[PDB]
């Protein structure tokens, strides 16, 4: 019974914002790895007969579905199968090509697919703009929904985009050479492998094959803005003297003139529409979108390497992994709908496209419309140049004489009857699905003008609203959270959330060491400082202001320290001025604003309280996907440990609190007891410190290892899920992680269900007393976690199976099962840390405190002094970021390690103590990180 009936209260969300109430009557089938997800939908693409709904934080066209035809071959397939099928593709619009998502490529390739379609176009794709509330800082938000939909019928949600280093099994193998292109994938590491030229798609020749039917860089692209040159004119005279000075440059060019190139190419490429538009490579875009869709769908066939001869698409650089470097395996929950609350997900994904056709249909004013014209002129002379160059200029001499393209971005709607779904008869039983979404009010009036530009008004439920933010992901999360009776069981990829102020950080060290070495101008050699004028630059924020003589008597000084001193210099530079970017384009909000880690603390308080049992269990990433070194993702890490452990009001801090206000109840009276649990101990810590957290709150990170190409290698499984159980009854599963971006509502869209299952099972949660749970969620947890002890792998591991741990799988509420967990995630991690240095652990092996000296950001790094932090420090052994991890240079060898022994199960503990003392604060404003 425990919330199984619809109409049984507090088991779904309700209220003033809701985009759908709970349906009963669903099949729903879990995906526990991204290999089966793929292949379901691999053959899902194959029975499409009328529609097929795609959208996604990131969409991939080659990425392979069922090991041998790629998204794009299977897509194309439907196409030539049912004449009346159309498809529509809706990736994230990111604003810049850095971010990886490559969603510029997969456009041209939806493109291809109508080429020698017999017909018309059916194949469509719009890239979404975000729609979040965010004002200035809007261009740092995204569309984050992971969804498809095919016939209006079959539905996909979760946390699974189509995309590079998505697939993967119960293996999570590291072995990345059988990996295609971008497919091979670990973004912490650098590159040290060659895509070769032939093997692989580069975006210019898929843009080449979009524009034709073909069935130094600095003075490169000084060359470049020297040909569209003939602007405010002030920049224009820079550029007219920056031009002359070039070519009469030697080889090597000046220093001084090597950084105001660099200081002149940035102003270019962020102030002009044309430079604008290769950064994300405005309405000149959408003009661009119309031009390529047309000649793409025009001609005679699609291009050979999308097809007869499928190739992956390349890196910008060809850089891969090499054979010894590890992919990083991948963590993460999908599911499928059949049923009513199918009529839901097509709803978001008919709204949303809707909503962006008629945002980006409008007409602009006639002096806008004329500088899209000219521009696009432009555009149009740099790519002509580019296929002139390719030797494809027989391509350019057939299309002279051909009518001035220029037709005006006019709406796609989808509102045909044959795409739009029928709203759904009343069911019972099957499972209760809700679908929730994380929406600003900005995106939710968008799709209201698209419901009046397309004419279609799906029937809603009563009480679903169509104005103002939805946090329905954060309601449900919250609506599971105090509803738990025994358990609750996180996968998420992050944990930010509110912890009140700051904690743990050491006096006298305002920033980290190693953020210090990034940011902070005082840990550079203080001689070159001081010649150049840095900190006055700095203080002005005006790098035109350097000494620029000094500058080029530095340049030629001989040694290692000079030539390296510019370098470090101008990346410095860099993150100090993404700072100030980030202030200005918005207001910084102050810590952290969503309450998940305050309401598992309130539902544990409340065990407490009672005396009854609880546990919460929380799986997360290592850190952050991507390097150690990079700014944003340390912060990222200091915002997880505050929100965790160190931040005043943490979940740790928190659950302690309450525990030994607990000992003292009745023994005094309030007020005076929250004083005599703050009272500090011998080492000076404050008592309730002293309180086993452990008894209510296991915290795992997953990691495995493996010898690749005779050397001894690990990576972190990256835990990607966003997925919530409670008690075996409940599953929340989609796209929100736990972090403000996700929760608030109004800044990237999110989308989820809330799952129950009417399919009874029995079952001893805690191991002694009956308890009716939900069926498919149970099989749902217990999959989950065979995988994440190594019970589903195929043979020949690293890794073996964690056996012992197999009597703990249907009785996640018994202290036993978590006390046997809990001590096999640090058995492991003792493991891993007897020979890796490097991994994130509690405790610096480098820096040779009663348990010694806590690890860095950086675990190699070590303080030069421990008396003055500020003296800064040094990485003492390689990080993995680091070329010199993986590759001999002229003085160093590559370092080798001793495989782990006894690692059973891919479970290890979450390092507590991980960067305690160190501010790893990046300078960018908060609420882009939050």
């Not at 009328?50 to 996604?56: N, Y």
């Not at 810590?591 to 409340?606: P, Q, S, T, V, Y």
Request: aromatic share 8%.
């Amino acid at each position: 019974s425990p919330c199984v009936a619809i109409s049984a209260p507090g088991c779904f969300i309700k209220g003033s914002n809701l985009f759908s109430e709970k349906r009963a009557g669903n099949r729903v089938r879990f995906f526990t790895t991204g290999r089966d997800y793929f292949s379901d939908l691999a053959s899902a693409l194959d029975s499409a007969s009328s529609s097929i709904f795609i959208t996604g934080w990131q969409v991939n066209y080659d990425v392979l579905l069922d090991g041998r035809r790629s998204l794009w071959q299977c897509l194309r397939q439907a196409l030539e199968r049912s004449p009346a099928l159309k498809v529509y593709v809706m990736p994230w619009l990111s604003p810049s090509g850095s971010l990886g998502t490559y969603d510029f490529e997969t456009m041209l390739a939806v493109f291809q697919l109508n080429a020698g379609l017999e017909g018309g176009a059916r194949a469509f794709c719009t890239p979404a703009i975000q729609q979040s509330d965010m004002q200035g800082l809007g261009v740092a938000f995204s569309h984050h929904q992971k969804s498809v939909v095919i016939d209006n019928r079959i539905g996909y949600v979760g946390g699974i985009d189509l995309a590079y280093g998505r697939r993967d099994d119960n293996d999570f193998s590291l072995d990345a050479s059988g990996r295609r292109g971008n497919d091979a994938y670990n973004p912490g590491l650098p590159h040290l492998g060659w895509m070769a030229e032939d093997e692989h798609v580069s975006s210019m020749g898929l843009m080449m094959a979009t524009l034709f039917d073909l069935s130094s860089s600095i003075r490169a692209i000084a060359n470049l803005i020297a040909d569209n040159l003939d602007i405010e004119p002030e920049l224009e005279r820079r550029l007219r003297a920056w031009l002359e000075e070039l070519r009469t440059a030697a080889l090597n060019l000046p220093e001084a003139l090597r950084i105001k190139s660099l200081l002149l190419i940035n102003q270019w490429m962020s102030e002009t529409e044309l430079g604008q538009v290769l950064t994300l490579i405005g309405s000149l875009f959408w003009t661009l979108h119309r031009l390529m869709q047309a000649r793409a769908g025009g001609h005679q066939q699609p291009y050979r390497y999308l097809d007869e001869a499928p190739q992956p698409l390349a890196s910008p650089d060809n850089a891969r992994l090499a054979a010894d470097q590890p992919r990083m395996p991948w963590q993460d929950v999908h599911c499928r709908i059949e049923g009513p609350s199918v009529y839901d997900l097509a709803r978001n994904f008919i709204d949303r496209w809707n909503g962006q056709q008629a945002y980006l249909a409008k007409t602009p004013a006639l002096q806008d419309t004329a500088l899209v014209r000219s521009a696009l002129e432009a555009v149009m002379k740099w790519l002509n140049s580019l296929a002139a160059a390719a030797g494809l200029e027989n391509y350019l001499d057939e299309k002279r004489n051909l009518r001035l393209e220029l037709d005006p971005p006019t709406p796609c709607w989808i509102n045909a009857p044959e795409q739009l779904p029928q709203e759904p008869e009343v069911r019972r039983g099957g499972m209760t699905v809700q679908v929730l979404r994380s929406a600003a009010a900005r995106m939710l009036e968008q799709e209201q003008a698209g419901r009046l530009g397309a004419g279609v008004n799906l029937p809603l439920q009563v009480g679903v609203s169509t104005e103002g933010v939805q946090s329905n992901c954060k309601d449900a999360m919250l609506l599971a959270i105090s509803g738990a009776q025994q358990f609750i069981y996180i996968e998420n990829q992050f944990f930010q959330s509110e912890f009140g102020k700051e904690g743990e950080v050491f006096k006298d060290l305002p920033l980290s060491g190693p953020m210090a070495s990034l940011r902070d101008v005082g840990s550079l050699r203080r001689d070159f400082v001081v010649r150049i004028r840095l900190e006055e630059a700095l203080e002005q924020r005006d790098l035109w202001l350097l000494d620029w003589a000094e500058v080029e008597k530095i340049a030629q000084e001989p040694g290692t320290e000079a030539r390296q001193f510019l370098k470090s210099m101008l990346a410095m530079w860099g993150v100090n001025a993404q700072g100030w970017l980030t202030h200005k384009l918005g207001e910084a909000q102050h810590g952290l604003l969503n309450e998940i880690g305050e309401a598992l603390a309130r539902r544990i308080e409340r065990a407490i309280q009672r005396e009854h049992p609880f546990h919460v269990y929380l799986v997360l990433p290592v850190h952050p996907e991507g390097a150690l070194n990079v700014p944003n993702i340390m912060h990222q890490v200091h915002l997880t440990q505050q929100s965790l452990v160190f931040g005043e009001q943490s979940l740790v801090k928190r659950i302690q609190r309450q525990m030994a206000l607990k000992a003292l109840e009745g023994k005094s009276d309030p007020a005076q007891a929250r004083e005599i649990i703050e009272r500090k101990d011998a080492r000076g810590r404050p008592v309730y410190e002293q309180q086993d957290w452990s008894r209510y709150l296991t915290l795992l990170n997953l990691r495995t290892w493996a010898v690749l190409g005779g050397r001894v290698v690990t990576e972190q499984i990256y835990v990607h899920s966003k997925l919530l159980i409670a008690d075996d009854r409940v599953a929340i599963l989609g796209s929100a992680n736990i972090n403000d971006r996700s929760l608030q509502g109004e800044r990237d869209s999110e989308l989820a269900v809330m799952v129950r299952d009417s399919e009874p099972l029995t079952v001893r949660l805690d191991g002694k007393n009956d308890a009716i749970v939900g069926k498919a969620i149970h099989q749902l947890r217990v999959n989950l976690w065979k995988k994440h002890f190594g019970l589903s792998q195929g043979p020949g591991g690293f890794v073996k199976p964690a056996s012992e741990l197999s009597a703990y799988l249907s009785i996640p509420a018994a202290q036993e099962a978590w006390e046997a967990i809990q001590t096999l995630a640090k058995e492991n991690t003792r493991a891993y840390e007897r020979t890796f240095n490097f991994i994130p652990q509690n405790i610096s092996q480098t820096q040779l405190f009663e348990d010694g000296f806590p690890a860095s950001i950086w675990p190699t790094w070590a303080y030069r002094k421990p008396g003055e932090l500020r003296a800064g420090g040094q990485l003492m052994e390689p990080m993995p970021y680091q070329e010199i991890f993986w590759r001999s240079s002229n003085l160093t060898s590559v370092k080798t390690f001793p495989p782990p022994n006894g690692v059973s199960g891919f479970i290890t503990a979450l390092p507590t103590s991980w960067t305690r003392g160190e501010r790893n604060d990046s300078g960018l404003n908060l609420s882009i990180l939050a």
